[PDB]
Design a protein around this ligand. Structure first.
Ligand SMILES: *Cc1c(COP(=O)(O)O)cnc(C)c1O
Ligand SMILES: *Cc1c(COP(=O)(O)O)cnc(C)c1O
Ligand SMILES: [Cl-]
Ligand SMILES: [Cl-]
Ligand SMILES: [Cl-]
Ligand SMILES: [Cl-]
Ligand SMILES: [Mg+2]
Ligand SMILES: [Mg+2]
Ligand SMILES: [Mg+2]
Ligand SMILES: [Mg+2]
Lengths: 360, 356
């Protein structure tokens, strides 16, 4: 039929082959004559999937052997409280770097549970940049330092990560995990809801340094202890089997295209198509982020006034574009260009943007 | 290529629901996207989300003063979320123990507050549901918690107690919407979807609104989810889509009374087989407490047990091994397990008995 261009911000576009693969075997997976959705998570067919998703992640991000990969329910939002519940012990501080709204939501949950600090923040200037690491106020009794690698709503992104040796570095990488190579040993823990760049909603990937968190925390509910899930290899209770399966399929696709290094090349190219369009628009489109902090995953911009914003977005929607409205809290536009968004969608958006501009 | 899916969780699903999912997996509702590729704030998703709630409301006849929540974390997270929200200081989390899942719920409550055992059949290895007249209740109970169907032991409440001093709370993971319910008997009902309602990944929580909070993490307050209609953060959108599909199938076959007729016939096939076997097969549950959802039984010794389960597997039956904690055999016959599978099981049981 007509064209559809999927710029949704979360859940988001999946790579077609992962979906075609799921569709073909939806009723009979691995010759069992059952859907993967109908299997015991103790079945060898399921365990193969569970283990393969872990091994693909390990290989793709080169995760060290002293790290474990968890598949948890509850979204990144649940990690906002689980993290301080496990690590923010009395006399210690949950130190946060604020670079957008998701950083503020993380902070808020730690505030419920312990002493918090703000290491650095760009909130005053509306989160248009990542602060300089030299501005980080660190504390000797920090339980961890928490960052948001990609600020989904504001369109900014860490170009690199701080060297932290006094506390574990923790990162919410929900909207840019496995969009590029990563030095995992810079971190104590990384977490990401899968639905932005790794597959479906319903599972959350948590990469954890085993010895930071494989120990029982007195007074913490069993399901909310990392230890529980580490010990049981994320099979303590019933996992989200179809979500993990789809995550596997998406990881296979990333591997098939050349891994993190190759997908970064693709992601830089797609992003360049949109940012050049903005930058050659003589101010008709204005990007929110400062240039040194531009996200490769979420491109945020405004037209010169709200009327033009609305006309632009209405025209896009009429032309088949999905998900371009900015987050409700900030307005404007947001082109989400995660791994699986195809480059011809980006080209299409550029065409839209140039004709709207020329015809305005 | 014969396969009979007696898996205990996750479990068989209705073929029409899976076929419908397959057909539109790449192009949901003419959007040219998978349901999996939609924003949860899209109208496209929001209609599915609401349709799943509406079908449960219709099928269980849930009154307006109850809200239906779709949460992540399984029934296991509910074990702690419930006392986290309702087990206030100076109140008691009161539990009726009718199996190991009862035990797991009570354990989580003991972390957070005072607990109590209203009644228990543990001493007799959970062969039955206790008589309601035996319950020991307290003025300051925060709730009374029961497990409606004891998945590992094969027993099930025939009816529910009339409790007015405190909300009645029920873990209905393995029998929700397998029969009509009087939802007004309860302050809260919860169930992982993965036995009777859908695939794993979503938990259905039916809660008396006015029933349910300083210092509880945002994600762990029922009020968060009630207030946001289970759209506070990203829900498990494909699992809720599949839940909708399963609910459409239940509606299409005639609803909760119709599925109960099917389920009672399925259980009748297996229990009759056991009762007519002259002690060759022995059911664990007392007759009066027999589950319609999980049929537990053993052969006369461990070696016959093992020979049977081996023969079953060779013949295409999946999931019949009993829980590791109790051994024996367990035939899980949740909603989507077809009558033909139970007939096949019967015929295998009879042939095995003849050939021993
Ligand atoms: C989407 C988002 C979240 C929220 O994840 P849920 O799975 O919806 O809890 C948290 N952090 C970031 C950076 C996000 O982009
Ligand atoms: C399966 C089951 C559970 C566990 O559910 P999860 O989703 O695995 O947490 C809890 N209670 C009962 C009665 C069950 O049958
Ligand atoms: Cl943000
Ligand atoms: Cl977002
Ligand atoms: Cl049980
Ligand atoms: Cl069980
Ligand atoms: Mg490959
Ligand atoms: Mg194309
Ligand atoms: Mg219908
Ligand atoms: Mg008879």
């Amino acid at each position: 039929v007509k064209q559809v261009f999927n710029f949704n911000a979360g859940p988001s576009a999946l790579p077609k082959p992962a979906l075609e693969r799921a569709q073909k075997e939806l009723l009979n997976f691995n010759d069992t004559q059952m859907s993967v959705m109908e299997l015991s998570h103790r079945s060898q067919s399921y365990e193969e999937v569970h283990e393969q998703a872990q091994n693909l992640l390990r290989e793709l991000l080169q995760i060290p052997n002293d790290y474990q990969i968890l598949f948890l329910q509850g979204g990144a939002s649940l990690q906002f409280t689980m993290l301080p519940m496990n690590l923010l012990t009395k006399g210690t501080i949950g130190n946060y770097v604020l670079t957008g709204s998701w950083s503020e939501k993380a902070l808020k949950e730690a505030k419920l549970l312990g002493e918090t600090h703000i290491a650095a923040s760009t909130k005053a200037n509306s989160y248009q940049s990542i602060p300089d690491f030299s501005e980080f106020q660190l504390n000797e009794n920090d339980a961890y330092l928490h960052i948001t690698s990609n600020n989904t709503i504001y369109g900014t992104q860490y170009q690199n990560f701080p060297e932290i040796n006094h506390a574990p570095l923790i990162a919410d990488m929900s909207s840019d995990i496995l969009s590029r190579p990563l030095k995992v040993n810079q971190f104590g823990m990384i977490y990401a809801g899968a639905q932005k760049n790794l597959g479906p909603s319903g599972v959350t990937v948590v990469i954890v340094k085993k010895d930071l968190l494989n120990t029982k925390v007195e007074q913490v509910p069993t399901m909310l202890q990392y230890a529980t899930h580490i010990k049981s290899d994320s099979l303590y209770n019933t996992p989200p089997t179809f979500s993990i399966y789809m995550l596997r399929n998406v990881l296979d696709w990333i591997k098939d295209l050349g891994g993190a290094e190759a997908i970064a090349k693709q992601n830089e190219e797609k992003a360049k198509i949109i940012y050049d369009t903005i930058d050659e628009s003589n101010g008709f489109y204005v990007g929110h982020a400062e240039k040194g902090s531009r996200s490769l995953m979420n491109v945020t911009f405004n037209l010169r006034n709200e009327e033009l914003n609305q006309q632009f977005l209405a025209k896009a929607k009429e032309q088949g574009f999905v998900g371009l409205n900015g987050h409700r809290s900030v307005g404007g536009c947001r082109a989400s260009i995660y791994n699986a968004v195809p480059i011809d969608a980006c080209i299409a958006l550029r065409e839209l943007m140039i004709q709207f501009k020329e015809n305005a």
